[PDB]
């Protein structure tokens, strides 16, 4: 037994009001033939200040958002050498 890049991102689709805090979550393995690749609007992204990323152990990852706003709404995309997959967060006015 010796699985590559798990996939196991239940990030079917996230939903929250405009002025509340959001956060991801998502459980991938470590890889073997090639490693999956983070990237928000199709081009790489930046985890600026208010966009801080953090890697934990068991190969957990956490995209931390801070005060979100209209325009931070976008699709996320992945892409591994493995397996492809995407996710759609919106925001709803309020």
């Given at each position: 037994?010796?699985?590559?890049?798990?996939?196991?991102?239940?990030?079917?689709?996230?939903?929250?009001?405009?002025?509340?805090?959001?956060?991801?979550?998502?459980r991938?393995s470590?890889?073997?033939?090639?490693?999956?690749?983070?990237?928000?609007?199709?081009?790489?992204?930046?985890?600026?200040?208010?966009?801080?990323?953090?890697?934990?152990?068991?190969?957990?990852?956490?995209?931390?958002?801070?005060?979100?706003?209209?325009?931070?709404?976008?699709?996320?995309?992945f892409?591994?050498?493995?397996?492809?997959?995407?996710?759609?967060?919106?925001?709803?006015?309020?």
């Amino acid at each position: 037994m010796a699985p590559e890049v798990t996939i196991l991102e239940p990030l079917q689709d996230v939903q929250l009001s405009e002025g509340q805090d959001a956060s991801f979550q998502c459980r991938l393995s470590r890889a073997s033939g090639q490693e999956a690749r983070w990237a928000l609007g199709g081009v790489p992204l930046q985890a600026n200040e208010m966009n801080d990323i953090t890697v934990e152990q068991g190969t957990l990852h956490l995209l931390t958002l801070h005060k979100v706003t209209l325009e931070d709404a976008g699709t996320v995309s992945f892409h591994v050498g493995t397996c492809s997959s995407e996710a759609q967060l919106k925001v709803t006015a309020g």
